[PDB]
Scaffold this motif. Structure first.
Motif, mmCIF file in Angstrom:
data_model
loop_
_atom_site.group_PDB
_atom_site.id
_atom_site.type_symbol
_atom_site.label_atom_id
_atom_site.label_comp_id
_atom_site.label_asym_id
_atom_site.label_seq_id
_atom_site.Cartn_x
_atom_site.Cartn_y
_atom_site.Cartn_z
ATOM 1 N N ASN A 174 -0.273 -2.952 7.151
ATOM 2 C CA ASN A 174 0.050 -2.367 5.845
ATOM 3 C C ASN A 174 1.249 -3.081 5.223
ATOM 4 O OD1 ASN A 174 -1.955 -0.324 5.591
ATOM 5 N ND2 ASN A 174 -0.910 0.955 7.114
ATOM 6 N N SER B 137 0.792 -1.260 0.000
ATOM 7 C CA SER B 137 0.000 0.000 0.000
ATOM 8 C C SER B 137 0.813 1.293 0.000
ATOM 9 C CB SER B 137 -1.005 -0.040 1.115
ATOM 10 O OG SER B 137 -0.320 -0.028 2.312
ATOM 11 N N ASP B 138 2.072 1.268 0.476
ATOM 12 C CA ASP B 138 2.840 2.499 0.402
ATOM 13 C C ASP B 138 3.436 2.696 -1.006
ATOM 14 O OD1 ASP B 138 5.088 0.649 0.332
ATOM 15 O OD2 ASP B 138 5.722 1.256 2.310
ATOM 16 N N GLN C 149 15.005 0.654 8.593
ATOM 17 C CA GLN C 149 13.939 1.490 9.154
ATOM 18 C C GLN C 149 13.149 0.680 10.172
ATOM 19 O OE1 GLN C 149 12.321 4.775 6.258
ATOM 20 N NE2 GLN C 149 12.620 2.956 4.968
ATOM 21 N N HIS C 150 12.279 1.358 10.907
ATOM 22 C CA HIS C 150 11.347 0.667 11.855
ATOM 23 C C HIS C 150 10.360 -0.158 11.138
ATOM 24 C CE1 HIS C 150 12.969 2.060 15.574
ATOM 25 N NE2 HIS C 150 12.893 3.321 15.174
ATOM 26 N N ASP D 258 7.933 -2.172 13.156
ATOM 27 C CA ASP D 258 6.914 -2.538 14.154
ATOM 28 C C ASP D 258 7.144 -4.074 14.425
ATOM 29 O OD1 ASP D 258 5.205 -0.233 14.444
ATOM 30 O OD2 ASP D 258 3.354 -1.211 13.860
ATOM 31 N N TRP E 98 10.944 1.361 -4.308
ATOM 32 C CA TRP E 98 10.014 2.222 -3.595
ATOM 33 C C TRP E 98 8.751 2.561 -4.409
ATOM 34 C CZ3 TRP E 98 13.817 6.547 -1.607
ATOM 35 C CH2 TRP E 98 14.601 6.017 -0.537
ATOM 36 N N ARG F 202 11.273 -3.046 5.568
ATOM 37 C CA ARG F 202 12.039 -1.832 5.207
ATOM 38 C C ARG F 202 13.408 -1.910 5.842
ATOM 39 N NH1 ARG F 202 8.900 3.413 6.467
ATOM 40 N NH2 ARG F 202 9.159 2.668 8.640
#
Ligand SMILES: [Cl-]
Ligand SMILES: [Cl-]
Ligand SMILES: [Cl-]
Lengths: 244, 244, 61, 244
Positions: A102, A43-44, A74-75, A77, A211, A71
């Motif tokens: 997501n 979705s991103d 990066q974080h 979660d 990306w 990612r």
């Protein structure tokens, strides 16, 4: 010498047409590659590509977890996403702080090189615990989905085959494997089995998260002369047979 | 109509018995799955399961490191655990701040689906540097351990096979691979080799760490109708042949 | 509400706050920011407006 | 047809001049917007803009704290800056580790759209505890500062009005509100009061910190056809009345 583009003695033009024809035909010989790509769209707007390139036959197999967005640097979660996975493996099995991750793929495209035989394509689209059809006991281990593959074409030539399916529903939680065999219009097979075993070791894999589909087109598909089909139904690739 | 459960015209009862019989027999046909699970039990009560589901034959192969406990999204003492690994690979090879890593498995259970042929089961239980029997030069690459597998039974039917071994000693530091072949009581084999090569690509894998054997039973084994044997010697699974 | 005020905010969790400043600059003007994503998942996918039954519908703006 | 730019039948030219004239006049009708911008300039060259766009009347009101520089997603010395605020609210009231906060604005520009009536502009420039003139008891709640607004002009037309004041001294610590009313050269007013109440809910706000006046000009002022006056006294905006 004769003047360019006016006679049958333009050997530079003849050699340029042969050079391209020889690449198309080499890839279709049994000395050539067969290739598959799995594109998982998030979705991103980012896209995970996995590609495998091998002789004779080729495939990709991924767990539910392995197809989730990651990612690098990066974080992510990570603890909540372990909990999301438990809830996807069994209803109410986890204690996540979100309804919908997501990181789940919104769609999958499978593309094969034009050297695959479409009739040999097999897909195992499993549930989130890697079972093909609800319970193991009743599962056929694959479906032969070649009839659904569309021809990706440029200038009249088939440059690859695509199967695309969206995962837009909350319950679309999958594990996935796909396999195709290189064209073999001959009756040759006997004597070559250990060479196929070595191809299983020699197959080369590539994986990366880009990306945006734009970036996939510009930095992945186009520089490597790979086939692709974008969200607007535009075909990418390079026609080679009998062409300059 | 005839009254339920009083005559040979209870076609709902006949179809329910056929539906279950057809699942049992389908799984034993060559169109069906063969499956294996490796359960690695940790001292905190958690259990890593790896499952592979494929046609024709199936296996799992893991390094020493890959079988150590990994807590997603939590601290894992990652630097000290690199040092522990060096000490396990060679005596006194690392500079760890512990005697015994609690991430080492305390036991392993191997379970196969009832569609495996037990006589084809092979295990490579290696040392911590992935050698089957002390030195490569003297190593047979597997042992055929089918005689040790116990029948997991429910209501008189075999629902799976289990081999369990504890790793309770400090020197129990292993790498592990296992393989079994699907039943084939026929003499058919010739013509199908590339289909077996495609099965190597199509095999689906699942891996997850559950926090307790209870949770494994309730959220993993039981919802998917899988066979299991718990620490109290209780058999789990679903009998299907000729049953409603 | 501003564009920014309607974006998702997770209290007490990570919100990619620096990258999301960059996303906002790219939304305010094409190519105005240096974000590491194409689409922010903090953007609303839909809006519902509901009024109580005591509103006069003809006065809604 | 007649040739372009040679006769009174260039209806494309007439319609282009009307299109622009209609925008200028629409904005000055009572159906149009009136707008205000507050620009707070910081020593690192960045600029906070707050804009409000509404019908009939419009304003902005900010505390001392709300006008201090805030860098989204970066360090902001938040604890020391609470202490700085206590020292600004009352001499020696805080225990900060700096003499001068670089987050304090160095200057303010107020700009109104050309649809404001300049004589209706009111400013409440308060001290750091939000009092307009030293003590509440002696404070008039605003000053009408329209005489100080300069015309921002392009090609002879007024495109906005500006009032600029520097805050270069240590004791320049302010809270700020400003308000202007849309032009109303008619005697119409009675009947429209609830519509003005609804305009108070419908007013749209925008706030952002841009990193440089250059960036403000290129990405904020110019793309939206807004008026501006830069530090070199250059006027920006678009002339529309009777123009192609
Ligand atoms: Cl060939
Ligand atoms: Cl069969
Ligand atoms: Cl009007």
């Amino acid at each position: 010498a004769d003047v360019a583009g006016t006679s049958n003695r333009d050997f530079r033009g003849r050699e340029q047409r042969l050079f391209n024809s020889e690449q198309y035909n080499y890839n279709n010989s049994l000395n050539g590659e067969v290739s598959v790509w799995v594109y998982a769209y998030y979705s991103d707007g980012s896209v995970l590509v996995i590609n495998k390139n091998s002789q004779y036959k080729v495939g990709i197999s991924e767990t539910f977890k392995a197809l989730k967005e990651y990612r690098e640097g990066q974080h992510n979660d990570s603890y909540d996403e372990y909990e999301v996975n438990q809830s996807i493996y069994y209803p109410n099995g986890g204690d996540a702080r979100k309804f919908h991750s997501n990181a789940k793929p919104r769609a999958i495209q499978i593309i094969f090189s034009p050297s695959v035989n479409v009739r040999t394509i097999k897909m195992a689209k499993g549930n989130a615990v890697s079972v093909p059809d609800e319970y193991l006991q009743r599962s056929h281990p694959w479906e032969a989905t070649g009839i659904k593959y569309r021809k990706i074409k440029r200038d009249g030539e088939i440059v690859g085959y695509s199967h695309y399916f969206e995962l837009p529903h909350e319950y679309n939680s999958i594990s996935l494997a796909v396999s195709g065999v290189h064209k073999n219009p001959s009756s040759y097979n006997v004597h070559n089995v250990m060479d196929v075993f070595q191809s299983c070791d020699l197959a080369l894999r590539f994986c990366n998260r880009y990306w945006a589909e734009l970036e996939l087109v510009n930095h992945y598909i186009s520089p490597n002369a790979y086939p692709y089909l974008d969200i607007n139904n535009h075909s990418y690739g390079v026609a080679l047979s009998n062409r300059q």
